[PDB]
Amino acid sequence: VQIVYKPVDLSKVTSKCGSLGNIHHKPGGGQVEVKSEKLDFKDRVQSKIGSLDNITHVPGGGNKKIETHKLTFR
Amino acid sequence: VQIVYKPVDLSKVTSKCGSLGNIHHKPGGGQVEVKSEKLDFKDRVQSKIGSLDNITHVPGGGNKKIETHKLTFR
Amino acid sequence: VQIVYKPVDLSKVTSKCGSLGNIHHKPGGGQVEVKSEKLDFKDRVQSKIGSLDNITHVPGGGNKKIETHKLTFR
Amino acid sequence: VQIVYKPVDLSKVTSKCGSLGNIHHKPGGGQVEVKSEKLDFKDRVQSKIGSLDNITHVPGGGNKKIETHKLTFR
Amino acid sequence: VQIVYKPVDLSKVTSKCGSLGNIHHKPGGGQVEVKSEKLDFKDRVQSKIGSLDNITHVPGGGNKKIETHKLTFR
Amino acid sequence: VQIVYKPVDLSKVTSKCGSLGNIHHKPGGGQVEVKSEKLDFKDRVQSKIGSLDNITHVPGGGNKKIETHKLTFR
Known part of the structure; x- marks a missing residue:
């Protein structure tokens, strides 16, 4: 092999x-x-309860190559 | 093999x-x-419960290349 | 093989x-x-409950090549 | 007299x-x-330009009584 | 007299x-x-430009009696 | 007289x-x-430019009584 x-x-x-x-x-x-009485979060949770978020993003070249080369063998 | x-x-x-x-x-x-009682989130949850979110995004070059080369074998 | x-x-x-x-x-x-009594979320859930979200997006080149090269052998 | x-x-x-x-x-x-270049107001001008006003007005008794008595002798 | x-x-x-x-x-x-340029106001001018005003008015009795007695003699 | x-x-x-x-x-x-370049107000001019005003007004008794008696003799 x-x-x-x-x-x-x-x-x-x-x-x-x-x-x-x-x-x-x-x-x-x-x-x-906000109130939050009895929350439960498990594994990969990404959460906002309350939010008032302001973003200015100006990368002047915001390029993003993204890859993944997963191999599995059983 | x-x-x-x-x-x-x-x-x-x-x-x-x-x-x-x-x-x-x-x-x-x-x-x-926001009020929130018995929330239960698992595995991969991406969440907002109450949002007022503002974005200005100005890449000057927003180019994405996204890939996935998943090979599996048994 | x-x-x-x-x-x-x-x-x-x-x-x-x-x-x-x-x-x-x-x-x-x-x-x-927002009120929320008994939400329950599992796997790849992407959720907004209440939202008032504003986006200005101006990529100057908003190209997105997206691929997937899944191979399997079972 | x-x-x-x-x-x-x-x-x-x-x-x-x-x-x-x-x-x-x-x-x-x-x-x-609002972009008002020129305005020219004289005397009792009661005015609004480009307003976005919200009123709740909840008397326990809205009882106006207006009684403008006047006399002139010349 | x-x-x-x-x-x-x-x-x-x-x-x-x-x-x-x-x-x-x-x-x-x-x-x-409000980008005003060249405004001009004379006497009892009562003026709003570009307002965004919020009011809650909750009197336990809004009982406005008004009685403007005037006499003028020549 | x-x-x-x-x-x-x-x-x-x-x-x-x-x-x-x-x-x-x-x-x-x-x-x-606000960007008001030139303004010219004379006498009892009551004015607002670019307001964003929030009022809660809760009398236990809003009972105005206005009684502007006037006499003139010439």
Whole structure:
């Protein structure tokens, strides 16, 4: 029995940009009220109960190569 | 039994951009009220119960390459 | 039994863009009330119960090559 | 010339109420822009431009009594 | 020329109430912009530009008696 | 010329209340911007520009009594 695993990667996940200033992020207020009486969370749980979340995201080259090379043998 | 696994990737997941400024994100307020009693979450749950979430997302190059090379053998 | 697996990729998942500014995102207020007595969630659940979510997305190159190379032998 | 002025009032402008109860006011706020270059207001101008106003007004007795007595002799 | 002025008032402008109870006021506040340039106002001008105003008014008796007696003689 | 001025008032502008109770005021505050370059206000100009105002007003007896007696003789 034999197994061979040689994934080759020569990829070039890259960016070019000019001037990037003058980004204004200016939230107002907000008011968040929560009760939570009897929660149970198990394994890979990703949870918000209450939220009032403000995001400015400006990567100037936001490129995302994503891979997975799962092999299984039984 | 012989297995030979050799993915190859030369990909140029890339961007070029000019001047990327003058972005204004100016969210107002918000009022979030939550009650939550007997919540039970398992295995892989991604959840929001009460949200008021604001996003400005300006990649300048939003390129995704997403892959999955799942091999299984019995 | 023998197996050979050689997926090649030479792609240019790419963008070019000029000046990319003058993006205004100005969410108002909003008001979210939630009660939840007896939620029960298992496996790959993606849930919003109450939400008031605002997105401005401006990728300058919003390309998404997406693949899957599932192989099985049983 | 004499002139006599003897107005009488006994107005029982009353109210009775029970319990002023479960009054909720929960506005999810809007979004406004105004661009008024030129405006020219003279005398009793009672004015609103680009308003987004929410009123709850819950008297235990809304009893206005308006009585604009006037006399002129020339 | 005599002139006799003797107004009389005995007004029970009264009120009665039970408990003033579970009054909740919960604004999720808005977003506003006002780019005015060259405004001009003279005398009793009563003015709002670009408002986003929230009111709960809950008097145990809003019993507004108003009695604007005027006399003018030449 | 005589002129006599003897206005009488006995107005019992009273109120009675039980418990002023569970009053909650919970604004999640908004966002405001103003750019007023030139303004020219003269005499009794009552003015607001770009307001975002939240009022809870809970008298146990809102009993206004306005009685603007006036006399002029020329």
